[PDB]
UniProtKB/Swiss-Prot annotation:
This is Pulcherriminic acid synthase. Heme binds at K57, N210, R266, C334. One of its GO terms (biological process) is pigment biosynthetic process. Belongs to the cytochrome P450 family. Pfam families: p450. CDD domains: CYP134A1 (cd11080).
C-alpha cells in the first residue's frame, strides 16, 4: 500500500505479500520509477497477450537496466527447434561430466558446484563455442547479467560490467566473421546464413547476447528449485523416482510455484485501462509473475506445491497457451520453451540417477535472492 516491492523486506520473501497485493493494490505504484507493478493474474495475462498495446524490446536490441518486431521469433524458434535433437547427447555429456568430480564425496552444491556451469555449457554448444573457455564466459555473463538485473551498482561493479561486455564483443565478433563464410550447424552460423531477416554483424552479436542471457540463468535456477521442492515434499520425490515420465510435470509445477523470471517489463504505446486504474501515455509496467501464479482465481490451493494438480495443463505447459506464466503468455512468450523443457528433463534425470539417496544436507539453510530473476543462494545436498 505504502509498502514497496523493491525493498529488502519484499526481496526477502515476495510470496508473503502477493495476496495483499492483488487484493488491495493490484496496480501498485513505485516511487523510484515511474513504473507500476501488476499482481492480478487476469491483468498480467491480458498485458502479455497484447504486445501491440504493451511493447517490449526487439530481439536484436541490446541489454539495458531493467529497473532503471518483424517476427524472427518464429524463425529463431524453428532454429532452436532443429537444434535440440543433435544437442541432446551434448546436454547429457555436460551433465555427466560436471557431476563426475562430486560423486566420490557424496556432496554437492547444485547451484554453485554444478548448476551455473552446466547452464553455461549448454548455451555454449547451442552457440557452438569451445567449452574449454567456459570459465571466461561464465564470468563475463554475470557482469552483464548484474548490470541488467540490478537496481543500483557500485562504480567497481559497473566498471566490471562494462569490461565484461567489452570482452564478449571482442570474443564473439571474430566468430561471426568466421561463420559468415564458413558456417556449421551451430546457432550463430544459422543466423549468419539467413536465409529468410538478413541480419548484420552488430545485430547478430546483440541477438546472441540476448540468447546468452535468456537461456542461462533460468535453467540452473529451475533445476535447483524443482529439486528443492521435490525434496521438501519427499513423498512427491518418491513418485518422481518411481516414474520418470512425471519429470515434465515436476518442472512445470516448479515454474508455477516459484517462477525464475519474477518480472516481465512492458511499455505502453497508448493510454490504456488496466484493472481499475488508468495508466498514462508510454510508461512502463511490471508483470509480477510470482503474484500471477499464486492467484486463487487461476489455480486452486495455489500456495501448495503439487506436481499432480489437475489445473496445470501439462499438455500445454511448455507453449504459448500455458496456464502458468513463467515463460510469459502469447505470441511473445519464451522462444526457448521447447529447449528449456528438454534440457531440464535431461539434467534432472541424470541428477536423480547418479545421486542415489539424495537428501538435503543437515543445517543447510534454504534462502532465495534477486528481484527480476530469482533462485536459491545455494543447494547443499548429500547422497550415496
Ligand atoms: C525454464 C527456463 C526459462 C524460463 C522460465 C524462461 C522465461 C522467459 C521469459 C519470462 C521471457 C520473457 C517472455 C515475454 O516477454 O513474455 C523469456 C524470453 C526469452 N527466452 Fe526464455 N526462459 C527460459 C529458458 C530459455 C531457454 C533455455 C532459451 C534458449 C534456448 C530461452 C530463450 C529465450 C529468448 C531468446 C527470449 C527473448 C528475450 C529477448 O527478446 O531479448 N529461454 N524467457
Ligand atoms: Mg543482479
Ligand atoms: Mg513476481
Amino acid at each position: 500500500k505504502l509498502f514497496s516491492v523493491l525493498s529488502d523486506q519484499f526481496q526477502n520473501n515476495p510470496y508473503a505479500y502477493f495476496s495483499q497485493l492483488r487484493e488491495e493494490d493490484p496496480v501498485h505504484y513505485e516511487e523510484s520509477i515511474d513504473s507500476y507493478f501488476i499482481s492480478r493474474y487476469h491483468d498480467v495475462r491480458y498485458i502479455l497477450q497484447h504486445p501491440d498495446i504493451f511493447t517490449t524490446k526487439s530481439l536484436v536490441e541490446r541489454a539495458e537496466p531493467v529497473m532503471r518486431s518483424a517476427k524472427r521469433r518464429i524463425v529463431v524458434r524453428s532454429f532452436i527447434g532443429d537444434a535440440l535433437d543433435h544437442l541432446s547427447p551434448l546436454i547429457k555429456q555436460n551433465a555427466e561430466n560436471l557431476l563426475a568430480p562430486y560423486l566420490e564425496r557424496g556432496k554437492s552444491d547444485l547451484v554453485n558446484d554444478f548448476g551455473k556451469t552446466f547452464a553455461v555449457c549448454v548455451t555454449m554448444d547451442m552457440l557452438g563455442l569451445d567449452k574449454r573457455d567456459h570459465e571466461k564466459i561464465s564470468e563475463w555473463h554475470s557482469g552483464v547479467a548484474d548490470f541488467i538485473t540490478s537496481i543500483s551498482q557500485s562504480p567497481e561493479a559497473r566498471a566490471h560490467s562494462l569490461w565484461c561486455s567489452e570482452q564478449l564483443s571482442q570474443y564473439l565478433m571474430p566468430v561471426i566473421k568466421e561463420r559468415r563464410v564458413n558456417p556449421g550447424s551451430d546457432l550463430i552460423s544459422i543466423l549468419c546464413t539467413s536465409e529468410y531477416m538478413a541480419l548484420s554483424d552488430k545485430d547478430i552479436l546483440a541477438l546472441i547476447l540476448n540468447v546468452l542471457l535468456a537461456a542461462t540463468e533460468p535453467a540452473d535456477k529451475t533445476l535447483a528449485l524443482m529439486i528443492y521442492h521435490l525434496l521438501n515434499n519427499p513423498e512427491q520425490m518418491n513418485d518422481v523416482l518411481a516414474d520418470r515420465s512425471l519429470v515434465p510435470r515436476a518442472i512445470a509445477e516448479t515454474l508455477r510455484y516459484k517462477p525464475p523470471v519474477q518480472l516481465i517489463p512492458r511499455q505502453l504505446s497508448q493510454d490504456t485501462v488496466v484493472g481499475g486504474m488508468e495508466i498514462k501515455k508510454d510508461t512502463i509496467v511490471f508483470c509480477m509473475i510470482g503474484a500471477a501464479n499464486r492467484d486463487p482465481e487461476a489455480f486452486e490451493q495455489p500456495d501448495v506445491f503439487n506436481i499432480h494438480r489437475e489445473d496445470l495443463g501439462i499438455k500445454s505447459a511448455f507453449s504459448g497457451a500455458a496456464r502458468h506464466l513463467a515463460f510469459g503468455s502469447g505470441i511473445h512468450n519464451c522462444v526457448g520453451t521447447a529447449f528449456a523443457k528438454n534440457e531440464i528433463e535431461i539434467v534432472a534425470n541424470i541428477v536423480l540417477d547418479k545421486m542415489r539417496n539424495i537428501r538435503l544436507e543437515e543445517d543447510f539453510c534454504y534462502a532465495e535472492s534477486g528481484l527480476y530473476t530469482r533462485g536459491p543462494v545455494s543447494l547443499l545436498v548429500a547422497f550415496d
